[PDB]
Design a protein around this ligand. Structure first.
Ligand SMILES: Cc1ncc(COP(=O)(O)O)c(CN)c1O
Ligand SMILES: Cc1ncc(COP(=O)(O)O)c(CN)c1O
Ligand SMILES: Nc1cccc(C(=O)O)c1
Lengths: 426, 426
């Protein structure tokens, strides 16, 4: 039963567009019956109707240490006694900044913002100001925030319902954005050859999460690194989802490729609204007040967000953190793929650390186009069935799933048991 | 003494651009020595060195009820026990949304975001999508976040730092931003006459705060309302600063002019990162997932921000709230102007509710150009002198000052006494 949710969502539709603060939450691609959360803790989420779920969304990435972690909460209660926002510098900004610099290879200087969208927006402007060029290359199926003159063929909630991008933004403004298929080096080389001295750089999700879970093919990241250097263009990694999840130093640390600039978000805020962008010192020097490129933020670097980020990173620095994530996630992933086979359903997927994907198609999936061959109607029934079995999964075939340090071996087994029950039907 | 601040700021400059998360905190135009806050409460702020100040910045607008208000803090402690972020709908979103709709005249449907920048960015895209036109009119000296099209004749930091239209912004996109001086109706009419059928609408600060405190001349707002209707263009009010401060319903309520869309921020977050944009239902229907215009936000509508906003608005709904603000602020404003006269310094200013301005120039100030005639060197000495006397003012001549419900009659008197001491020197 979802009586209270239906009631609250119905009322919500009269107050907010589509009745949500964010598109993907409306469940448009899986039925249209969203459930309203009341509280979350560890690896679970609870309904406004009392239903308990094993959560695989983790508020979309931030809850890697588990929901309402006791130490994060405790640190927040103590900090807010001093005020939630200053509007002036505080020591905690220095602490988190230093922690981020040590953690992320390419980051020598950082700037805190309030969301991944603000960070990506700032990084685009910075790419152009530093190179003096206007064109940017992005990949189909990737999402870097709703940046006006750039938001085109984005993933996330956009691809959730087959939505393209925009409108609003003029066609002239979006002419400075080039697109190519993810994992396609040749397409990228062609774009440079065809636009000599006009590409500021390339921005991408080192590991895709907004058009399903997609890993880069061998030599793809290395390839992009080489071609950008060859044309004095910048290589920008959007690690808003991957940062601190794939590895403490993100994908750039794990796979050994160092970008010039990287954006961070989610986990770095420990649950609160936070974003960040940084990279080579010579580039960050253009950011005001040090440089001419203007970018500001009233609540940027507020003590509460800083406190939550610091505590979250300290927890991740503990022994066996990423080993545990990889272990339970592989068990979850393989298990799902074994069950699909045993029940006769074509499927593929995979995982790296605490991030996984599962598509209802034989694949393999190398790009957004491949991802779109998935049987969306089957995913819809699968999703509803799992929900009824007490498992909460992203309400979209084009969203990667997430695991946390709070998920236990038993939670995993219970999820597999539920998946067998569900797929046996379908 | 500011030993600890100098030490922390020095280290900060090696970790973050200019050593700050936001340009204005820089103190560039006032000496260069920012003070690092440790805590804030009621109407005061405390140094990392132990110096206590009577705060007139209020973290730039949010702290209208005073810093660390007991009821807001208490409501936050209880709420976070349930988790800081869900990534799914929650009942609290419905509550705040409804409160905002009742409070703001033009708002029939609302969408929550994470900052004023995100709200203004969404509202620009919406203006264009709804009208099918690309050009926008903004005023010199106004600030609507750091979205690209807005970095033209921007106020706030850009003004303070004497920066030009920001670099890294394609000429293509900037070409769609038309500007005009504030309070100049004729200039606005000319822009329409010169661009038939291309203006989506006009966006402005109903009462300016980012190029000093500037009130609209008689008939200016009414004039803009009439010309926009005449050409089927939209009138957009950026009430990120004015919302809930000038009046419960903002400037639109106070001055009787109803826009088509309005952006909110600061106060609505009660100290946490929050933004919002809403207006006529027929326009908000284009926002995804209800409409084609895509705009998302991971932490948008999170329970902690919602809880803080709700509590803050309930406090403001209490009897005598705005009367008290107007009373103590007028007393502060007039007092400052009386002291400048008595000590022989040319000055002008004013206030509306809990928002005031003070310029070192005879004025009057009707626009950004007038504001720039202010003696910045004198302001610099005035600012430092006040700081040494225990009064914390915005580190810029182009930033409006703020008052709170926690400021007492005695705090005001102590500020006037300090101003006499300071201006007697200079
Ligand atoms: C790769 C990437 N970049 C940017 C963002 C924007 O994040 P936020 O909502 O925090 O602005 C997201 C969230 N979908 C993302 O996945
Ligand atoms: C009128 C106005 N609009 C929008 C903003 C952007 O606010 P935020 O820092 O919340 O992005 C500001 C503050 N710079 C503002 O003063
Ligand atoms: N842009 C802008 C406006 C006001 C305050 C701030 C801030 O960092 O405190 C930034």
């Amino acid at each position: 039963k979802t009586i209270k949710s239906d009631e609250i969502f119905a009322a919500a539709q009269k107050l907010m567009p589509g009745g949500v603060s964010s598109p993907v939450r409306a469940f448009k691609s899986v039925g249209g019956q969203p459930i309203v959360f009341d509280r979350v803790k560890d690896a679970y989420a609870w309904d406004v109707d009392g239903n308990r779920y094993i959560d695989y969304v983790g508020t979309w990435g931030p809850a890697i240490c588990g929901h309402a972690h006791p130490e994060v909460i405790e640190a927040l209660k103590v900090a807010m006694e001093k005020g939630t926002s200053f509007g002036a510098p505080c020591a905690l900004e220095n602490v988190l900044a230093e922690m981020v610099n040590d953690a992320v290879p390419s980051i020598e200087m950082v700037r805190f913002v309030n969301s991944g969208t603000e960070a990506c927006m700032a990084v685009l402007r910075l790419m152009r100001a530093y190179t003096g060029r206007d064109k940017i290359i992005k990949f189909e199926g990737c999402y870097h925030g709703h940046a006006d003159m750039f938001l085109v063929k984005a993933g996330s909630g956009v691809a959730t319902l087959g939505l393209p991008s925009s409108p609003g933004v003029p066609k002239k403004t979006t002419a400075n954005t080039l697109t190519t298929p993810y994992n396609d080096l040749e397409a990228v080389k062609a774009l440079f050859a065809e636009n000599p001295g006009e590409i500021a750089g390339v921005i991408l999700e080192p590991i895709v999460g907004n058009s399903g879970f997609i890993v880069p093919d061998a030599g793809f990241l290395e390839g992009l690194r080489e071609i950008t250097l060859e044309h004095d263009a910048l290589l920008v990694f959007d690690e808003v989802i991957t940062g601190f999840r794939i590895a403490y130093g993100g994908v750039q640390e794990k796979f050994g490729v160092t970008p010039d600039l990287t954006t961070l978000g989610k986990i770095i805020g420990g649950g609160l609204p936070v974003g960040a962008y940084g990279g080579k010192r010579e580039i960050m020097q253009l950011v005001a007040p040090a440089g001419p490129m203007y970018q500001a933020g009233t609540l940027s670097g507020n003590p509460l967000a800083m406190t939550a980020g610091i505590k979250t990173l300290e927890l991740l620095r503990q022994p066996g953190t990423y080993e545990y994530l990889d272990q339970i996630t592989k068990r979850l992933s393989d298990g799902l793929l074994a069950i699909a086979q045993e029940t006769g359903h074509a499927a593929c997927g995979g995982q790296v650390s605490g991030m996984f994907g599962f598509f209802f198609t034989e694949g393999p999936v190398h790009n957004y186009e491949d991802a779109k061959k998935s049987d969306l109607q089957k995913f819809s029934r699968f999703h509803r069935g799992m929900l009824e079995q007490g498992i909460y999964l992203a309400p979209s075939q084009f969203e990667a799933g997430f695991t946390s340090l709070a998920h236990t071996e038993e939670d995993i087994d219970a999820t597999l048991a539920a998946a067998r029950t569900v797929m046996s039907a379908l």
